[PDB]
């Protein structure tokens, strides 16, 4: 029932997903208006600077967070590590993120995400990767970007690349589409579905570097459906204020006066 | 009605296809027991040695051949030259061969073969190319080989590559299949259809260098369904004898005494 | 009055242009139904075989041809050789072809074609080149291809590239168009005019390798407005028959039965 | 109305623009005689020392500065970050600087500056870049230089490059201008407008390394219309004295005795 | 009696092997349910930290461990150091691990393991290496991975590569098997025995980076028969809890709820 997973992930459209590390940060991110939280033991800043290997978050804190908030609760699973995905599905979380922000568990293969009843969130960097992940079973796509620096140049480049490939495909001659599918190394049926829909067949989020309401509004204006905000919110001077500002920016991405007032 | 085209091409299984250049060579190739003829103005030996550009054969001689024999009659169309394919379909031939033996008309794109009611025969060199051509609409695949030298080393290598990739796919773990589909740059749905069927989803012929009954029997024992024999038959000491020998070799590819007697 | 030149070149849409070398070939190409002739002393085949430098055609034979036929009469002028263009305009021909088929007269600069009252026909290989030539003053564009071989792989590649850039531009986001204009090194105003019109702002012809009615119909179906047929027609078995066939193919580029009957 | 923005930016001719970080530095820069201030949260020295990503300055301090001084107030916006530009336009600042001194927000595309009613200030390093930015909608150009070192070698090189390209263009033959437009990858219409005006069609400022009155006078003597002075004035022994000296040097760029007295 | 060694190593199937450094860690790893311990002076983490050369563990502590636990006791022997293997066999340990985790003693040659009555455990990275080690006399194979980092990307890659070569071999045509044996540089007789059995002819363990129950279950689901856990268990917050969790994960590698509860 892949379409069931797609429709389940649709209710995340137009929202913000916030990396939380405890029940209190989860409660704050809930009261700020986020649509879902990404439970994890310690922020991507730890994964980047502290080094070491980062794995699926501990089940006990996932259960604590899930008991603390009412919104959908996500968790991260290493790429190709289908047993972490099995554990997460057995905990009962709402969405699973096959996260490249964590450490690679299988360099060559991703999870055959058709085996789980839980919708997956998979990273991408272009149209070919997004279509491959949707073929593997990912019910929601997020553009990769760059993890931990707060610089949106790569996230902006990836959103622009995905939307540019979509716009190119929308007018592309039928007889050429096949070659395009070979240029991306993406499944042809999904390429034709994209060409018919004018967009990816799934929800499409942005991630990596989104730190200010201006960045979230820029992502939502480039065509995305939402944003991921990981660590810069709760390490700042006031976490609740910045989180509420980013939520309001995503909700009102076409209101410059609102973006000003929230900033 | 792609399945209609596939079933229409199935009756070519276990036969020989002979390049003919006139009504008399067509009549000989018919009396030798061929399943179909490939009408063309002058042999692949001409295309190789004389040089110049080779195009779709002249419509008048196609009509003469079609009126001279009763078996299915093929014709060659340049790659990506869909107007030659339109002309051939309007003449009423039975199969169209998007032939790389001719001159390339579109280096980047092949014909969107779903637009014609006539089944197409497309060349290939590996599993990825065969699957891409089947996705474009080709109702019958022939392994490329090398055109005009009578040396089957490349044709044998291509048959072995295709059948080896299919055998690898047949046992391959499901979770890895996706990556395999990216390695070939072939449509995933066709890759899964191949993995289920244990063979290429269409009829699969051999071509290039098949000159003696031993070569035809070798191709039919490597797993193919038929062979193409272009020029060396009608330039030899006795064309009818060699053509009948190759036909008998394809029919009895598992009878060494028969291969001896026909040689 | 550039728009006057554009409207003047519009009457060539849906026609055939044939290189003639005498009053007799000009009369034949007229009776075959061509829309214009390109006077020249000796065919591109002679330019290849006799070697040496090729220049503007001789004024006396231009006057003879112009007095022999009634259709528009073209002539070739070396690239950047504005004095040959002045001579041609003083003879009174209808269109001037700043032709790369001839020998380069100015490797770095083309003619500032705004100084002549006669419309120009300029070669191109992509969208950037076509837009640059339209900015210089070219009132009609022909896709370069490859001169003298009868192989349409390059002409088809160039038509597909130009039409693909146009289709990409048509959906391209406005904020990105500027960068596109830098990628092609084409004037931005002409890029925006193309994006608005959905096609090149001038008449767009094909040239190079068009030898059979299938090739002409393929060019006219890929989006072109006409074709150039230079030498292979009058060196063949019957020039009038092939010329009439190509004219009928251009006129009926969407009629497969007509393409069959003329072939 | 791009001409309205151009005429509105004209009043900055012959003045100094000083980066301020508080109401007090803004008041000093006003009393020193500057024509405009570039409000920013922390000087380029902080961008180098604290490292990290630098974004649009905080709206609250922009409002404080705007309420503290009477002169036009600028602000910096990341390249391609049109949402930061929207926020700045909604605050009501006078000029927006699409600043490469900040961090790149879009590596491939710049802001489509035609969508805002506020004039923009865009950096440049040669004539092609200045013309491209003027085509995108920039109503004022500043030569890039090098940010934060106090060494004017690069700013001088870029000013000389722009003025040398303009001088080359002024005498350049018309028939060659097109090729020149291709050499720069700049819009041809703007190239011709430059050739007619003898200078860039907008106000042209200098930036990067201007630290002493000699440097400001040198920039104004090389042909510029003003200078940018960012940090070195307020970190020195006396900010008011050096700021007044630089202002007087810009006003009297042809008075060596005045340059001596102010130094 | 190689088959006796193979049957002796069979009782380790479906178990966990834990590197111990004293009688207390050995006792803990016994109560956690491990099937065998790998006596060694200082953990692979200590081998990485203190640097220097690592050799066979000291005989006195091996005797102490062997007297402290009842399960089979392993020990490490440098590669090609057959005298350390003689010493270990004379101590009376149950299995000897010709371990690349230690320092290489013979870079070009491994131990001729047919000379000892004690079964050997040899590392491997692909099918060729595993078959070569089984030919030398190794009665049990463990996939190499990467030593001491806790990252299972390489261990997963090696398990997938070995099982992929086995699956490729299982369907491979007999006439091609010989060439396959040359591609791996593995003994052909063992290649045919593998092709017949559908798996490596010996017990196949995983090693390197297995730190969490998810990793152990992932190894056991990829096709392995067990796991090696060296250092990260006894340097953690609770060694007994994590060791018992990993043992339960290996025992119940197909029970997601169990993997959750033990985590």
PDB file of N, CA, C and O in Angstrom, chain A residues 160 164 166-168 170-173 175-176 222, chain C residues 160 164 166-168 170-173 175-176 222:
ATOM      1  N   UNK A 160      17.181  23.753  -6.296  1.00  0.00           N
ATOM      2  CA  UNK A 160      17.146  24.303  -7.642  1.00  0.00           C
ATOM      3  C   UNK A 160      17.411  23.233  -8.686  1.00  0.00           C
ATOM      4  O   UNK A 160      16.780  23.243  -9.743  1.00  0.00           O
ATOM      5  N   UNK A 164      14.683  22.165 -11.324  1.00  0.00           N
ATOM      6  CA  UNK A 164      15.072  22.414 -12.698  1.00  0.00           C
ATOM      7  C   UNK A 164      14.953  21.177 -13.562  1.00  0.00           C
ATOM      8  O   UNK A 164      14.496  21.253 -14.703  1.00  0.00           O
ATOM      9  N   UNK A 166      12.818  18.820 -12.957  1.00  0.00           N
ATOM     10  CA  UNK A 166      11.378  18.636 -13.122  1.00  0.00           C
ATOM     11  C   UNK A 166      10.842  19.534 -14.231  1.00  0.00           C
ATOM     12  O   UNK A 166      10.060  19.096 -15.083  1.00  0.00           O
ATOM     13  N   UNK A 167      11.243  20.806 -14.231  1.00  0.00           N
ATOM     14  CA  UNK A 167      10.758  21.727 -15.255  1.00  0.00           C
ATOM     15  C   UNK A 167      11.254  21.331 -16.639  1.00  0.00           C
ATOM     16  O   UNK A 167      10.528  21.472 -17.628  1.00  0.00           O
ATOM     17  N   UNK A 168      12.492  20.843 -16.728  1.00  0.00           N
ATOM     18  CA  UNK A 168      13.025  20.364 -18.000  1.00  0.00           C
ATOM     19  C   UNK A 168      12.220  19.169 -18.488  1.00  0.00           C
ATOM     20  O   UNK A 168      11.877  19.065 -19.672  1.00  0.00           O
ATOM     21  N   UNK A 170       9.135  18.436 -17.779  1.00  0.00           N
ATOM     22  CA  UNK A 170       7.730  18.731 -18.048  1.00  0.00           C
ATOM     23  C   UNK A 170       7.483  19.066 -19.516  1.00  0.00           C
ATOM     24  O   UNK A 170       6.444  18.701 -20.074  1.00  0.00           O
ATOM     25  N   UNK A 171       8.419  19.764 -20.157  1.00  0.00           N
ATOM     26  CA  UNK A 171       8.308  20.083 -21.574  1.00  0.00           C
ATOM     27  C   UNK A 171       9.028  19.093 -22.475  1.00  0.00           C
ATOM     28  O   UNK A 171       8.770  19.083 -23.682  1.00  0.00           O
ATOM     29  N   UNK A 172       9.922  18.276 -21.926  1.00  0.00           N
ATOM     30  CA  UNK A 172      10.761  17.404 -22.736  1.00  0.00           C
ATOM     31  C   UNK A 172       9.925  16.549 -23.678  1.00  0.00           C
ATOM     32  O   UNK A 172       8.851  16.065 -23.315  1.00  0.00           O
ATOM     33  N   UNK A 173      10.417  16.386 -24.904  1.00  0.00           N
ATOM     34  CA  UNK A 173       9.744  15.547 -25.884  1.00  0.00           C
ATOM     35  C   UNK A 173       9.681  14.110 -25.392  1.00  0.00           C
ATOM     36  O   UNK A 173      10.614  13.620 -24.753  1.00  0.00           O
ATOM     37  N   UNK A 175       9.853  11.257 -27.020  1.00  0.00           N
ATOM     38  CA  UNK A 175      10.871  10.394 -27.607  1.00  0.00           C
ATOM     39  C   UNK A 175      12.228  10.548 -26.938  1.00  0.00           C
ATOM     40  O   UNK A 175      13.049   9.629 -27.015  1.00  0.00           O
ATOM     41  N   UNK A 176      12.486  11.679 -26.286  1.00  0.00           N
ATOM     42  CA  UNK A 176      13.747  11.893 -25.594  1.00  0.00           C
ATOM     43  C   UNK A 176      13.715  11.435 -24.145  1.00  0.00           C
ATOM     44  O   UNK A 176      14.782  11.193 -23.569  1.00  0.00           O
ATOM     45  N   UNK A 222      11.290  28.241  -3.134  1.00  0.00           N
ATOM     46  CA  UNK A 222      11.922  27.521  -4.231  1.00  0.00           C
ATOM     47  C   UNK A 222      11.112  26.310  -4.670  1.00  0.00           C
ATOM     48  O   UNK A 222      11.442  25.700  -5.691  1.00  0.00           O
TER      49      UNK A 222
ATOM     50  N   UNK C 160      17.814  18.722 -32.669  1.00  0.00           N
ATOM     51  CA  UNK C 160      17.376  18.279 -31.354  1.00  0.00           C
ATOM     52  C   UNK C 160      17.941  19.160 -30.254  1.00  0.00           C
ATOM     53  O   UNK C 160      17.238  19.456 -29.289  1.00  0.00           O
ATOM     54  N   UNK C 164      15.637  21.392 -27.972  1.00  0.00           N
ATOM     55  CA  UNK C 164      15.709  21.038 -26.569  1.00  0.00           C
ATOM     56  C   UNK C 164      16.027  22.227 -25.690  1.00  0.00           C
ATOM     57  O   UNK C 164      15.446  22.385 -24.616  1.00  0.00           O
ATOM     58  N   UNK C 166      15.193  25.244 -26.467  1.00  0.00           N
ATOM     59  CA  UNK C 166      13.974  26.048 -26.468  1.00  0.00           C
ATOM     60  C   UNK C 166      12.955  25.483 -25.487  1.00  0.00           C
ATOM     61  O   UNK C 166      12.317  26.229 -24.732  1.00  0.00           O
ATOM     62  N   UNK C 167      12.782  24.160 -25.477  1.00  0.00           N
ATOM     63  CA  UNK C 167      11.825  23.553 -24.557  1.00  0.00           C
ATOM     64  C   UNK C 167      12.264  23.722 -23.108  1.00  0.00           C
ATOM     65  O   UNK C 167      11.426  23.892 -22.217  1.00  0.00           O
ATOM     66  N   UNK C 168      13.572  23.667 -22.854  1.00  0.00           N
ATOM     67  CA  UNK C 168      14.088  23.902 -21.510  1.00  0.00           C
ATOM     68  C   UNK C 168      13.810  25.336 -21.088  1.00  0.00           C
ATOM     69  O   UNK C 168      13.378  25.603 -19.961  1.00  0.00           O
ATOM     70  N   UNK C 170      11.476  27.312 -22.150  1.00  0.00           N
ATOM     71  CA  UNK C 170      10.060  27.660 -22.074  1.00  0.00           C
ATOM     72  C   UNK C 170       9.508  27.516 -20.660  1.00  0.00           C
ATOM     73  O   UNK C 170       8.684  28.328 -20.225  1.00  0.00           O
ATOM     74  N   UNK C 171       9.939  26.490 -19.929  1.00  0.00           N
ATOM     75  CA  UNK C 171       9.519  26.295 -18.547  1.00  0.00           C
ATOM     76  C   UNK C 171      10.490  26.873 -17.530  1.00  0.00           C
ATOM     77  O   UNK C 171      10.135  26.974 -16.352  1.00  0.00           O
ATOM     78  N   UNK C 172      11.701  27.233 -17.946  1.00  0.00           N
ATOM     79  CA  UNK C 172      12.722  27.691 -17.012  1.00  0.00           C
ATOM     80  C   UNK C 172      12.208  28.839 -16.156  1.00  0.00           C
ATOM     81  O   UNK C 172      11.473  29.708 -16.628  1.00  0.00           O
ATOM     82  N   UNK C 173      12.584  28.824 -14.880  1.00  0.00           N
ATOM     83  CA  UNK C 173      12.213  29.900 -13.972  1.00  0.00           C
ATOM     84  C   UNK C 173      12.849  31.206 -14.421  1.00  0.00           C
ATOM     85  O   UNK C 173      13.994  31.227 -14.879  1.00  0.00           O
ATOM     86  N   UNK C 175      13.960  33.767 -12.724  1.00  0.00           N
ATOM     87  CA  UNK C 175      15.153  34.121 -11.964  1.00  0.00           C
ATOM     88  C   UNK C 175      16.391  33.373 -12.438  1.00  0.00           C
ATOM     89  O   UNK C 175      17.509  33.830 -12.183  1.00  0.00           O
ATOM     90  N   UNK C 176      16.222  32.241 -13.117  1.00  0.00           N
ATOM     91  CA  UNK C 176      17.347  31.486 -13.642  1.00  0.00           C
ATOM     92  C   UNK C 176      17.702  31.866 -15.071  1.00  0.00           C
ATOM     93  O   UNK C 176      18.835  31.612 -15.495  1.00  0.00           O
ATOM     94  N   UNK C 222      11.036  17.144 -36.712  1.00  0.00           N
ATOM     95  CA  UNK C 222      11.769  17.543 -35.518  1.00  0.00           C
ATOM     96  C   UNK C 222      11.516  18.994 -35.139  1.00  0.00           C
ATOM     97  O   UNK C 222      11.978  19.434 -34.082  1.00  0.00           O
TER      98      UNK C 222
END
